[PDB]
Symmetry: C5
Subunit: 331 residues, 5 copies
């Protein structure tokens, strides 16, 4: 055997009872799988690498080059115990074998790599939905060893993060990849060191505009055509107004089916409900005209009405002003 | 080897054949994942810690400080067998390794930690839905050892429970975390000791008001506009009343799709069905007026009707009185 | 070692080559999880206990009391091979360890306990849905040993079954827990002994009445208001009848979405389809009146119609008679 | 030890380097779980048995009777490697232990049994849906050994297949169970022997008739009532025709939601689309009558129409003739 | 033992510390399971084979023929570590045992086979939906060994890919199977060799035409019948136009439910929205005619209109011209 595995007890970390052993980390991101709004989490697949030195794995050689083993010797030597904080579920690929790489240098330097898929939670805000921007992060920490036994740091600082050129999302735009570092404290175990991977996401507005905003505007303009119809056709104008109200209500209900039960109103809800009020007022507009006409005929017994003439101009002006204000605030 | 594992039989608990061995528990709650109304359960992720003493794990040292091991030695020593009562499913994270911490003091004190995700059932009441308040609890108990072999208690009493500052729910408000203790009895095994973790939840009413209460009120007020229309436009008032009835029926059906099949009526159902009656009576109101007008014309052959004039005042008054009573009982 | 495990071959049952060894069973039911109508199965969680004697596990002592082991010694001794017949899926909880209890008396008596969750199929009949009553059972049998090698019986007869006081179902009522015993035969292995656990379930009718029966009745009574309207308002009565027909059709379609594709008609289907016929005949009623009026005017050229007057009384009488008969048969 | 397991190398099949060893198979079917139309597969649970002889397992005895072992000795002896061809997923039950039976005769005959649940794909044709008939089969084959090393055959020919009396499907009728045998060839490994289990399935038509065919016919007959209404009530006949068209379109859309995206038209689609044409032509029928009446009045200025009179007879006759032809082809 | 497994250390690859060891791959495709548009991935089941030589597995014989082992010896020898790049989930069938084949020649040649099901992502474009064509590929690569330690190549070049004759998709047409080879580079591990399997898919247009295109055209032609009706029947033409608009809106909404939220407009959306404009303009057409008639009567106070006469010809001509252009671009 090139390595004297049986001659050492690997139940203790290198430098047991002494100073902490530094550990390096390199991360390459492969792809992002899915994002859930109701569950507020994301899925990521990445390659995780570790760097440390152990004199117990030294072997004699003359070339001074790294040597690669099959990978099943990992379960017989000491390995760090990094874990993902605030994660919901994760696993390691095992086809056709465990995705494990083990390279040992003659002086004892060890390279360890893994391929994992991790799901982590992220707190999102939907105040500006669907024109919002979300930021999420991934955390890496050691579970068992504190800062007095193991020191965790990025292997090459800002250059330790790499991303595949094929990473893309159908509904989101990915940008601003960077890493940071911060300490963590637990009241009953001590202090630990954490590593962060940050990114930013931006939605695409084309789908929401075509599916929600355009149908809403068309329904509002449909109610305006009743002002150009003669008021004597009562069974012809009343159904027009009512059907528009019912259609607008159906549109509002269908939008909320794909969003969670938040406690605050979203930007899309404001636009839909304001449009509902405009259509509702249109129905009441004809009711006033009909009542006044009946009273006028009764008084006389014992042309275009003024309300209709002014409604032709006031209603389009108010809606256009609302759009200018609404789109200026939300850009 | 620092620990003489092979020199002892760890198939028996410490103090075998004698007095019970005390065990301490510390719990830190990380996050709450989801709540299901149809399944009546919740998901929680937390850190579980154990405290006990075993003289068989003593090792000589001079510093008198805790020493940390990699964690795979756990399967070779005695470990408590705590389990969650009334749970449906649960698992332990194993990425990149099992989330296990093992610290042994020179005198034999042992610290054991785990990271688990547990789903437990909770009996909820929906008599005041969606303005209800729910209380749920989590139970921890030893499966194999009774009170005569193992004693279970909180390590620091009221101070043994900690919660993360990031715990939040989109639809619920979390409050009132506390712990209690109670004994349990089984008819064929004996007595056991249980530990409890309690919390309270409160819903948010904004979503339900906007999605259900507001559309219901608007439909009811839509039927009131028919009283101001001339009764001679029969094909103009009948469609107005009928379409409101159909729309109200659609609203009622859609609400129940997200709730289980309970055997009692909820608060939201009362409001919706009362509104349905109001719209239904509105349709019958015009039928009486039309019939009386036809009879009056026939009698004469051989203005505003009195029913319409009184309906303009009675109907709004009754609905407002209902709202005052309904919102006073349910606050 | 207190037990001489290594001195015996546990690959053979006690009393190998001789008479059968009796085995006792005790069962305590914890909770019922869910019931599926489309899949026709139920999920149950329970505690399973076994009783037998093995002289190879005897150890010397003076107190003559049961001793409890950690539970990992089970995989080194002989254990029965009970399994659940007609089950679809099942598993054993393993958090934080396997829920296994092992107690051995000095004379060799052994107590073995497990905690499992089992899903078993049940053949249900929906002829009286939703006022039906269903009976299901759970079967326990030994897989490998016949009656000539292992005898299976209840430990205490009728007293071997216990149920938790917290067992409840939102939609069903649980009652009539009892156990029976019957033999089973296989054409190629021999005879076996089976154990049964039986229970009965009853649905709650409040949800079905409010969601289905009440809307159906209201729609039928809505068609009756057309008989009190003047027949000269043709565009006012025809839409009333047609909209009721379409609404009734929508109600019928939505009910079947939650039931499987059975080959027989259910009780709820009879009520809905009879109501559909009543509304359909109402539409045809006005068509006859309109045609006769046109013919009468044409004959004359060259008040209340008799059909309308009789329809006001005949239609309510027929529907009430149908309800009396329908509710008398199904109680 | 009764069996000299440690004295032989079980890494080689019996008769290594010589003639093939015959293997027998017995199969008993327990139940069928589910059938998926979109995924085109079925799930089956069955008992699998094997028969072979191995002189290395011989033990001395005088009774000459089969002896049963606990079953964990299987992993220490040679076992066939049968697998299911064209399967998607499968597993073996392991509660409370692996469902494994091992019986060895004194001369060396071995009986091996297993309990598995297998999902296998089946190619179905929906040209006659929902009045179609489907045939599916299950395949058993050895993965590692060819015909020159292992010979596979049915233990008792036609009598090797047994079925439980409780096998039933809610939507399908099961019949025609039989077994066949055929060889298989691979271009790079050689020849193999396969075993087949065949069965036939037939759907139930009651659900489809009541849910789809009856509503379609009623809508078609609803359009026929407009021919008996006076043509002067234009706003009374036009809504009747249009609402029937929209309702028919809704029925057609809902049916396809439960079927995959096939590239050929089904039997149910033909009936629905022909009915849609009949209703569509009814709307065009009144348009011609209205236009001709207006032209006739204009010409005159400068009773029952002939089209309506003929439509009362032609339309019912055509639909009845279509039903006779449609139901004669599909029986 | 025929193979001297215990006499070698299989933790190192053959030719350790020297030149790379060539590895051959053979692939036979069994079936394609499903394709998801929202998730943009596909599922494939295939047989994977490996070819290499290892002198440590040599055994003496005279026949010089391949010998087959049970397959559990794989976990005791060196095996390649191939994995699928850009995959989401995958597993290996294990019923009734692991689908593993191991054949070793006397000189040391080894044959290794597996049966796996792999889900891999594919980037699709929906600019021409539903008349689009998609291309997807599958990637195979070694995870641990670079090109300096292991060389990967196709065993027989273009002849190494085989497909089952039963491969079919209900909605897609499969064609153009071929394989390629390309190198891959990682910034922190080195260079690797990849293998590709490519295929092309084409949709079927029959379902989309019948379900979407035909209903859209019929609704457009329904609005054209209003031009042949007398303009004095105001309550008869206005409902016709409005109901067509609402029906067209319902059709548009239902189509997008089965597609993801892309940021570009599809071919089907263009056809639907253009038809919506045609129906919308039809409603405005009658409004102009009604207003002009009222003004003309008022001026006179103090036949067929010209707009209707021209609309009968202009509207059909424009729609036909649009269809010719639309179907010429998309073929
Ligand atoms: C506006 C509306 C709903 C819409 C119409 O029915 C009118 C009522 C009037 C009473 C309101 C109620 C919404 C909920 C309110 C604001 C209650 C709450 O603070 C809820 O916690 C107190 C009074 C309630
Ligand atoms: C109110 C309604 C349903 C709604 C209309 O069809 C009228 C019937 C009248 C008969 C009622 C029935 C509901 C169910 C009842 C109350 C039965 C039950 O105790 C059920 O266990 C006995 C009589 C039944
Ligand atoms: C009643 C209905 C459906 C509803 C209307 O379209 C009228 C047809 C008339 C012909 C019927 C058919 C239902 C299915 C029947 C009874 C067939 C079967 O035995 C089916 O196996 C033979 C004749 C068929
Ligand atoms: C790649 C690398 O670092 N190679 C060095 C080599 O240059 C040096 O001569 C040798 C002596 O130990 O150590 C190693
Ligand atoms: C985006 C980001 O955080 N970039 C940082 C940069 O600000 C810092 O100057 C550098 C050196 O530590 O590391 C990196
Ligand atoms: C942290 C702690 O408890 N340290 C004590 C130390 O103060 C004491 O001198 C020693 C003697 O055994 O035991 C240990
Ligand atoms: C919320 C709650 O139960 N708090 C209890 C408190 O009432 C009790 O006095 C204290 C000391 O045991 O423990 C804690
Ligand atoms: C609980 C029980 O059964 N205890 C008995 C004890 O009374 C008896 O004296 C002893 C002698 O072997 O056996 C044991
Ligand atoms: C509900 C039921 O079956 N109860 C039985 C009872 O009839 C029988 O008399 C008794 C004694 O065996 O066992 C129990
Ligand atoms: C069941 C059976 O086959 N029994 C036979 C027995 O009749 C025969 O005397 C014996 C001699 O070896 O072999 C065995
Ligand atoms: C349904 C079927 O295939 N039955 C066959 C039968 O035709 C054949 O004669 C018999 C003897 O081999 O085996 C069985
Ligand atoms: C199938 C095959 O390759 N057979 C050859 C055989 O022809 C040759 O005589 C032998 C000598 O080693 O090697 C082997
Ligand atoms: C479809 C395809 O790529 N076919 C290639 C072919 O072009 C090439 O000439 C041949 C020899 O390498 O391999 C194969
Ligand atoms: C009814 C359609 C109104 C369209 C109003 C256009 C508003 C443009 C906003 C531009 C903001 C910079
Ligand atoms: C139709 C709208 C009626 C609104 C009635 C307001 C009731 C306010 C309740 C306040 C309770 C304190
Ligand atoms: C239209 C409502 C009819 C209500 C008929 C009441 C029937 C009561 C049944 C009582 C059976 C004991
Ligand atoms: C509109 C209802 C038409 C019913 C036609 C009955 C056809 C019976 C087919 C019998 C075939 C043997
Ligand atoms: C309203 C129906 C218009 C039908 C137009 C037919 C267009 C045929 C396109 C042929 C392209 C080669
Ligand atoms: C909802 C009541 C409408 C009353 C309209 C009165 C117009 C003068
Ligand atoms: C449902 C019957 C309505 C009868 C109305 C009679 C008005 C006097
Ligand atoms: C469905 C045909 C209705 C015919 C009605 C005739 C009334 C005398
Ligand atoms: C769709 C055009 C209808 C034209 C009807 C003309 C009747 C003579
Ligand atoms: C001359 C026709 C005017 C129509 C105005 C329609 C406004 C949407
Ligand atoms: N490093 C995570 C952690 C939590 C704990 O209690 N101990 O370690
Ligand atoms: N501690 C739980 C339990 C149940 C049982 O039967 N034995 O232990
Ligand atoms: N005890 C169940 C069973 C079935 C079989 O074939 N052998 O045992
Ligand atoms: N017996 C199945 C099979 C396939 C193969 O390549 N080798 O064996
Ligand atoms: N061969 C895949 C891969 C990625 C990596 O980081 N090392 O290997
Ligand atoms: C809509 C406003 C009308 C005002 C008439 C004086
Ligand atoms: C709605 C009540 C009317 C009363 C007329 C006397
Ligand atoms: C509805 C029945 C009417 C009978 C007229 C003679
Ligand atoms: C529906 C056909 C009518 C023919 C009139 C001559
Ligand atoms: C629709 C165009 C009409 C033009 C009349 C001059």
């Amino acid at each position: 055997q090139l390595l004297r595995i049986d001659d050492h007890d690997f139940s203790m970390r290198p430098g047991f009872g002494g100073p902490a052993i530094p550990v390096g980390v390199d991360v390459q991101v492969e792809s992002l799988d899915s994002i859930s709004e109701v569950d507020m989490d994301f899925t990521m697949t990445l390659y995780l690498r570790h760097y440390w030195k152990d004199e117990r794995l030294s072997f004699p050689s003359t070339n001074n080059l790294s040597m690669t083993f099959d990978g099943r010797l990992v379960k017989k030597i000491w390995v760090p115990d990094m874990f993902f904080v605030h994660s919901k579920r994760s696993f390691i690929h095992d086809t056709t074998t465990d995705n494990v790489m083990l390279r040992v240098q003659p002086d004892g330097k060890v390279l360890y790599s893994l391929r994992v898929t991790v799901t982590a939670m992220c707190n999102m805000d939907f105040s500006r939905f669907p024109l919002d921007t979300q930021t999420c992060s991934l955390e890496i920490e050691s579970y068992a060893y504190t800062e007095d036994d193991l020191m965790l740091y990025w292997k090459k600082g800002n250059d330790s993060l790499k991303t595949d050129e094929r990473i893309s999302l159908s509904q989101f735009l990915i940008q601003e990849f960077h890493t940071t570092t911060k300490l963590a404290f637990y009241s009953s175990t001590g202090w630990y060191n954490r590593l962060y991977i940050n990114f930013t996401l931006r939605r695409h507005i084309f789908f929401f505009l075509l599916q929600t905003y355009f149908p809403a505007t068309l329904m509002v303009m449909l109610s305006w055509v009743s002002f150009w119809i003669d008021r004597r056709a009562v069974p012809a104008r009343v159904p027009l107004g009512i059907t528009t109200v019912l259609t607008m209500s159906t549109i509002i209900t269908g939008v909320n089916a794909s969003m969670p039960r938040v406690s605050y109103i979203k930007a899309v809800d404001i636009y839909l409900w304001v449009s509902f009020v405009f259509v509702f007022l249109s129905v009441l507009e004809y009711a006033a005209v009909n009542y006044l006409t009946t009273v006028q005929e009764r008084k006389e017994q014992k042309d275009t009405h003024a309300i209709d003439k002014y409604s032709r101009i006031i209603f389009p002006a108010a809606y256009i002003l609302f759009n200018l204000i609404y789109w200026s605030i939300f850009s």
